[PDB]
Design a binder for these strands. Structure first.
Lengths: 84, 105, 99, 93, 96, 78, 92, 104
DNA sequence: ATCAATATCCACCTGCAGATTCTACCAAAAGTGTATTTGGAAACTGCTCCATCAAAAGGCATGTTCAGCTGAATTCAGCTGAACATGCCTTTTGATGGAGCAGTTTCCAAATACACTTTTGGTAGAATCTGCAGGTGGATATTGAT
DNA sequence: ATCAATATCCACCTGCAGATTCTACCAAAAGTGTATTTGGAAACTGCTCCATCAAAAGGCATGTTCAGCTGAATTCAGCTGAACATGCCTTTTGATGGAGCAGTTTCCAAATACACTTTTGGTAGAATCTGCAGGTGGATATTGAT
């Protein structure tokens, strides 16, 4: 298709500011944005890694919402709303 | 031909629940009272959260319960908040809450 | 005047606004690329149900928001109002995510 | 291709408590996840409980103690009452 | 001869981080245990190992908690732990 | 009884936790925390006791309680 | 009655450290360890098969459970040991 | 002629099988599952005994005690992660004092 | 940094006692040999759903200015919490008994699992309904400058 | 304490994407007639579990002193918030090809079910031993003082 690179920077400064707002944050240090990206990436690798493991185990090529839901349950981040 | 639910005075499905218990590999045998007791508790809890969610919907002047209403009902209720403390409701947002120290001095 | 709100006023206005709503705060397409990159530079030839991508976004945004609340408490605790990398690190360490 | 759900039952209880109120499919999705979740926690705990007591069958008694272990204070007290009441009413033929 | 404040404190940390013996006196602990248990079920008996599991669990819990409290105090540029430190740690931990 | 958990013993715990200096209000705060901790675990343990129709709380009852509270303990039957 | 993993833990202890012994308390620790890991692997394998509507737990479920449960390097070796024992078992 | 020796393991394949069948995990259990699971349990056991043994040796001891099992677990990044929500009775904690608390 | 004077640590040995390790044996699993059952893999194939494209549109991300006011430094002294010598009592601990009670036995009546055979309660879409998302405008604050 | 400048409300409106019902089958409860267990219910043990006793001993509760840590009060350099100009690229709508879920059948290699035959592992005594807990004696680490 087309090489996927540096997409973490797709998580913009304003999108991170918004999330901090919902989280009740008033003031944000300039270095928070790169820390947040680093933290999101780790969060996403761990969940995606488990979701894909459930996918491969079912011998499928398509990651399903259920694959993600089970991965989230394992990680202790149970999610309601996609149990179909 | 009475449904076990009606025999039990319940809305939730006693048969379905009994079947789910036997096919979930929880034990080798499942007593007849198990699905009845479990269907009732499940029914009571969904009645508890819908009561509170319906009220949140009313307070927001809507007649249709949406995810946010479910969140407001759960996070504002100490026991439900405890019970679902490690759960996340898609499209629920969070409670309006601003630390005092942050308000205009 | 030109009119100008004092620093902090708009931030407080934004907190009230976003704590009022429930829409996703990160742009859709960009986040989907991030998932595809991480997934791919992990296992090739993967496909995704659209709802699977949304499950991840909903989950990762509730996580960051919750993390920021904890981060904010760590800053207030240091007698600050500005969150720093140091606060996120303290929160993650106490949450047992890194210790 | 047919998938079961608790929607029918969640919807009945809703009319009982709030006759005037409706529920969006997404909210119903949340409710279905919730029922399924508490079901697994109760069943899970009942499963263990029986195992620790070298018992091969899960009875309303296991479900009861699982309920007291899982739910906090009041919620437990009320769930137990409904549960017991439904069982006695069920056995009363 | 008198050691300066902090010196004996550091010495104790070294001694206690080196050992594994329970730090709370047994009898007092067993007493606290039975009393609380009494509120849930009267006239209970306790296997001695039941009491020991509880003390082991309690002490490892309190030690772990003091570790996070200390980190919270250091975070506020302090060296003295206070109730606000314990409070913050438990809040972040999700115990509150 | 909780006052039985003494200042010095709470100091020792703190020390193994690496704490150098302790505020005077810590002792009472610690006891309140220990008590909530014990109430939660014991309540659950005793629930396993009543369930097995016993009059004696066993180490295994405690071990299972601790497991539920996300405090798995090794060395007492699991 | 009252079986435990003591005998086996000990045999393994002699394989890696012939010269070393182990106290009762330490043996209790090891027993808890084995029981715990056993419950986590089986529990996960249990879920995996249910998610995939299968009624039998094969080495395949045990393997994925291990990948999901053990961190990186522990997973690799555990997986290696595992497939190795099933191979040596099948053959002769 | 036991299944263990056939699989070349010290851990009891037969018991693991019985424990799997009677643990209410699934309707059926494949023949390899107990073998595989037994191999995994033995390996982790060897891993820990290996490191705890060294912990004893570095302590001038020949007998592995709880303290040693704790020093082995906590000083190993992976074992520590795996047993992150576990407490080893009589294990104590790793010596560790925050820099800021040091003298001078 | 040294000088000197306390207390702290730290080896090296060393003697026993509490546990370990080592033995000598019997039930309850584990391993076999057969005889059936069956779950779920291989072989199609119906057809959702996902990956892609095209294209226009304006919501928002980017960058740059500017300067309010927050975080980081300093200073300083009041007073909290450490180090200690004292004096004493609650914790240890070690039998010694008596006994409340987990664990077993032996039934077996009540409760379950089974194998079918009918009977619907539910689920999958079409056919109907409708809150309310999105717009618009003054009423009402809220702010921040004089 | 006033007001402009703006942001925030709240109510009134209306078609439509998103519920609610209305209809049809049929996978899965419900009703019956047997074939197993399950797990209480009494009766009895051998245990572990409280209860005292009873000394002695640390280990804790106190009252003194004062070192030095926590905060309060001041400064201020410059980070980070608020605004604005620009125009990029995420959003929306729709249309398609066809990858690859999912549903059906077809049916063996593999798992379950006994009926027995052997064997291993959990017990309850027996034969050593690893370390604890002291004992010096000798450098260390602290802390006061030229």
């Amino acid at each position: 298709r087309k090489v996927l690179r540096d997409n973490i920077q797709g998580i913009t400064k304003p999108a991170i500011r918004r999330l901090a707002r919902r989280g009740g944050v008033k003031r944000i240090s300039g270095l928070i944005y790169e820390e947040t990206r680093g933290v999101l990436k780790v969060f996403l690798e761990n969940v995606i890694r488990d979701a894909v493991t459930y996918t491969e185990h079912a011998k499928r090529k398509t990651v399903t919402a259920m694959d993600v839901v089970y991965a989230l349950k394992r990680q202790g981040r149970t999610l309601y709303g996609f149990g179909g | 031909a009475k449904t076990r639910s009606s025999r039990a005075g319940l809305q939730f499905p006693v048969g379905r629940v009994h079947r789910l218990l036997r096919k979930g590999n929880y034990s080798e045998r499942v007593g007849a009272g198990a699905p009845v007791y479990l269907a009732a508790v499940l029914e009571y809890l969904t009645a508890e959260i819908l009561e509170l969610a319906g009220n949140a919907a009313r307070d927001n002047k809507k007649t249709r319960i949406i995810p946010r209403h479910l969140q407001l009902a759960i996070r504002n209720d100490e026991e439900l908040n405890k019970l679902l403390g490690r759960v996340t409701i898609a499209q629920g947002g969070v409670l309006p809450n601003i630390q005092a120290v942050l308000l205009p001095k | 005047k030109p009119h100008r709100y004092r620093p902090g006023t708009v931030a407080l206005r934004e907190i009230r606004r976003y704590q009022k709503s429930t829409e996703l705060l990160i742009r859709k397409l960009p986040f989907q690329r991030l998932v595809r990159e991480i997934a791919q530079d992990f296992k090739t030839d993967l496909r995704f149900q659209s709802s699977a991508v949304m499950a991840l976004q909903e989950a990762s945004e509730a996580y960051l928001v919750g993390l920021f609340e904890d981060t904010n408490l760590c800053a207030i605790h240091a007698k600050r109002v500005t969150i720093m990398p140091k606060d996120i690190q303290l929160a993650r360490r106490i949450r047992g995510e890194r210790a | 291709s047919r998938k079961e759900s608790y929607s029918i039952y969640v919807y009945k209880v809703l009319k009982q408590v709030h006759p005037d109120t409706g529920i969006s499919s997404k909210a119903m999705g949340i409710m279905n996840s919730f029922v399924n979740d508490i079901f697994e926690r109760i069943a899970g705990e009942a499963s263990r409980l029986a195992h620790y007591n070298k018992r091969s069958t899960i009875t309303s008694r296991e479900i009861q103690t699982a309920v007291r272990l899982l739910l906090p204070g009041e919620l437990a007290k009320h769930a137990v009452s409904e549960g017991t009441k439904a069982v006695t009413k069920y056995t009363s033929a």
